[PDB]
Amino acid sequence: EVQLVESGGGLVKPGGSLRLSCAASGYTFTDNYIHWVRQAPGKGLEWIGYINPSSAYAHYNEKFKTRFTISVDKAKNSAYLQMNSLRAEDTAVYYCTRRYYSAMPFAYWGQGTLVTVSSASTKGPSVFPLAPSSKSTSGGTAALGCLVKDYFPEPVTVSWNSGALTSGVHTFPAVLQSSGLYSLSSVVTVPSSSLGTQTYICNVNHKPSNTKVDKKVEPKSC
Amino acid sequence: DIQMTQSPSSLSASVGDRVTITCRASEDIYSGLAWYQQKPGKVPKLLIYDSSTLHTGVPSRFSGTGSGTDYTLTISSLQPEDVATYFCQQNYDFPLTFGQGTKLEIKRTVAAPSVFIFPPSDEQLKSGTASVVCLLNNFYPREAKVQWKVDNALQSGNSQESVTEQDSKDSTYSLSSTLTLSKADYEKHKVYACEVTHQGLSSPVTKSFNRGE
């Protein structure tokens, strides 16, 4: 239908600059403004500003003018959020959004893109299997998973079987290790009777390190 | 700017309860008020606009009321899929401003956890670290005690826990406890066990394995 798709997040150093993009589809781009909103724990949701794609006129929350600039490229049906002179406390999920229609609230949201402002370096994860065994199988159900360890910054995404397996999946919130790197596990419960005929692959993506790993999780003989 | 104050910041209630969340603006916004619902990690979803009109697809148990500075969101009969954080937003003057959110949790009946353990993978051991994962699946309430014992010696300081968001269908939780050791420390011991205490279990449950087996 109407869709907004963001790109460009990830890691940036304090004082640095970063540009996000918002590609609009499913409607005539110039018929509605594009707005930008961010979300972080503590200050919550904050509205940054809008741009009118027909005139390229942008209007801002005064609070944000020193670090944020909104622009458009009509040829690409895209709006952009340019960030400058970023502070560590500007770490947040950034959304583009569109009104339902003129003067109405926001019915359509981009997926959100986390921007992490930090001096630490990017690190891609290692992916290890959590293989089903007699110790994770009971009552006709087997649990299996993937351990995704030692990455920075957030986030990693995990899918199973390229998105075809969603039922029974638990992808846990990441924990911060004392090393300063993150870890998480993703687990799924499936029939124990099916382990010999079905294939279970965890698809791990860590965009900041350009890491994409597929790990086939095979049963353990214990 | 117009400041939006929501109350309460969090609440928990049972299926079938009538729940109310309030939003107060620092000045009259003349019914120019929206409500959004957000699940963890997901986008906000528009629920209500013009203070009392439900958006496409929103169940009739939701309602919005109020005028002037004071507005209310009411869920007439709470359902498990209503677990979420709810935000108000004034749409009357720029800058657009949002309330701080109300996190809504569900109370329900006891459900005992299924307990599973995963020894470290051969792949990880080749690199010099050993992670042992204990999984408590689909249980209620969230409170649970997980203890690690290595050759029957109680561990402390080498594990971390993570709990899932509450399930949108059955209101249960899952929990991981991960014990991390250097490969050398791991090879100093034989028996690795996760002991789980929970209200739904008549006695503590232990899942265990022997290193190297």
mmCIF file of C-alpha atoms in Angstrom, chain B residues 112-202:
data_model
loop_
_atom_site.group_PDB
_atom_site.id
_atom_site.type_symbol
_atom_site.label_atom_id
_atom_site.label_comp_id
_atom_site.label_asym_id
_atom_site.label_seq_id
_atom_site.Cartn_x
_atom_site.Cartn_y
_atom_site.Cartn_z
ATOM 1 C CA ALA B 112 5.045 -23.424 34.359
ATOM 2 C CA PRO B 113 8.171 -23.009 32.211
ATOM 3 C CA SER B 114 9.600 -25.651 29.935
ATOM 4 C CA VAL B 115 13.331 -25.784 30.757
ATOM 5 C CA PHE B 116 16.010 -26.545 28.161
ATOM 6 C CA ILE B 117 19.814 -26.444 28.249
ATOM 7 C CA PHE B 118 22.340 -26.037 25.416
ATOM 8 C CA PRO B 119 26.007 -26.966 25.915
ATOM 9 C CA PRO B 120 28.562 -24.788 24.147
ATOM 10 C CA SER B 121 28.908 -25.532 20.461
ATOM 11 C CA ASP B 122 32.003 -27.169 19.061
ATOM 12 C CA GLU B 123 32.264 -24.125 16.781
ATOM 13 C CA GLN B 124 32.510 -21.727 19.721
ATOM 14 C CA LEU B 125 34.858 -23.926 21.742
ATOM 15 C CA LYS B 126 37.377 -23.870 18.888
ATOM 16 C CA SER B 127 37.761 -20.112 19.632
ATOM 17 C CA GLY B 128 38.511 -20.292 23.363
ATOM 18 C CA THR B 129 35.210 -19.357 25.015
ATOM 19 C CA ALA B 130 32.305 -21.489 26.268
ATOM 20 C CA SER B 131 28.729 -20.211 26.510
ATOM 21 C CA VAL B 132 26.087 -22.416 28.155
ATOM 22 C CA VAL B 133 22.463 -21.392 27.590
ATOM 23 C CA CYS B 134 19.535 -22.256 29.853
ATOM 24 C CA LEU B 135 16.104 -21.494 28.367
ATOM 25 C CA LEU B 136 12.802 -21.098 30.225
ATOM 26 C CA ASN B 137 10.051 -21.093 27.635
ATOM 27 C CA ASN B 138 6.525 -19.655 27.730
ATOM 28 C CA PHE B 139 5.891 -19.179 31.436
ATOM 29 C CA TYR B 140 3.953 -16.854 33.723
ATOM 30 C CA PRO B 141 4.571 -14.869 35.943
ATOM 31 C CA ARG B 142 7.906 -13.360 34.960
ATOM 32 C CA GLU B 143 9.483 -13.971 38.364
ATOM 33 C CA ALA B 144 11.796 -16.992 38.317
ATOM 34 C CA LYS B 145 15.039 -18.015 40.010
ATOM 35 C CA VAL B 146 17.758 -19.497 37.811
ATOM 36 C CA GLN B 147 20.945 -20.738 39.446
ATOM 37 C CA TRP B 148 23.984 -22.263 37.801
ATOM 38 C CA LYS B 149 25.834 -25.092 39.509
ATOM 39 C CA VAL B 150 29.131 -26.463 38.249
ATOM 40 C CA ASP B 151 30.197 -29.731 39.898
ATOM 41 C CA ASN B 152 27.510 -28.837 42.467
ATOM 42 C CA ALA B 153 29.208 -25.509 43.350
ATOM 43 C CA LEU B 154 26.850 -22.530 43.129
ATOM 44 C CA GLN B 155 28.068 -19.961 40.598
ATOM 45 C CA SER B 156 27.956 -16.190 40.808
ATOM 46 C CA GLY B 157 29.305 -13.462 38.556
ATOM 47 C CA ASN B 158 29.527 -15.315 35.235
ATOM 48 C CA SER B 159 25.947 -15.305 33.891
ATOM 49 C CA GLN B 160 23.505 -12.857 32.334
ATOM 50 C CA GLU B 161 19.758 -13.075 31.869
ATOM 51 C CA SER B 162 17.449 -11.705 29.183
ATOM 52 C CA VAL B 163 13.622 -11.833 29.218
ATOM 53 C CA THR B 164 11.330 -11.502 26.215
ATOM 54 C CA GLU B 165 8.512 -9.037 25.770
ATOM 55 C CA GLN B 166 5.162 -10.413 26.899
ATOM 56 C CA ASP B 167 3.501 -12.562 24.203
ATOM 57 C CA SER B 168 0.636 -10.851 22.375
ATOM 58 C CA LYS B 169 -1.501 -14.036 22.297
ATOM 59 C CA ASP B 170 -1.005 -15.895 25.598
ATOM 60 C CA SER B 171 0.710 -13.205 27.737
ATOM 61 C CA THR B 172 3.622 -15.497 28.667
ATOM 62 C CA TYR B 173 7.341 -14.790 28.870
ATOM 63 C CA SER B 174 10.530 -16.578 27.960
ATOM 64 C CA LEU B 175 13.915 -16.161 29.642
ATOM 65 C CA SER B 176 17.493 -17.019 28.737
ATOM 66 C CA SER B 177 20.339 -17.391 31.249
ATOM 67 C CA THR B 178 23.796 -17.607 29.675
ATOM 68 C CA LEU B 179 26.842 -18.819 31.621
ATOM 69 C CA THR B 180 30.111 -17.695 29.998
ATOM 70 C CA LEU B 181 33.496 -19.194 30.847
ATOM 71 C CA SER B 182 36.916 -19.257 29.298
ATOM 72 C CA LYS B 183 37.551 -22.581 27.607
ATOM 73 C CA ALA B 184 40.217 -23.262 30.259
ATOM 74 C CA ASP B 185 37.852 -22.628 33.183
ATOM 75 C CA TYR B 186 35.226 -24.753 31.417
ATOM 76 C CA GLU B 187 37.593 -27.736 31.137
ATOM 77 C CA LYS B 188 38.321 -27.585 34.887
ATOM 78 C CA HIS B 189 34.820 -28.936 35.677
ATOM 79 C CA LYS B 190 32.556 -31.794 34.599
ATOM 80 C CA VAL B 191 28.873 -31.311 35.513
ATOM 81 C CA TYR B 192 27.026 -28.209 34.278
ATOM 82 C CA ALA B 193 23.499 -27.634 35.570
ATOM 83 C CA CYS B 194 20.751 -25.007 35.453
ATOM 84 C CA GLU B 195 18.385 -25.103 38.451
ATOM 85 C CA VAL B 196 15.047 -23.316 37.990
ATOM 86 C CA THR B 197 12.630 -22.317 40.764
ATOM 87 C CA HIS B 198 9.212 -21.034 39.685
ATOM 88 C CA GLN B 199 5.682 -20.842 41.085
ATOM 89 C CA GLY B 200 4.347 -23.255 38.464
ATOM 90 C CA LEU B 201 6.817 -25.983 39.457
ATOM 91 C CA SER B 202 6.181 -28.092 42.555
#
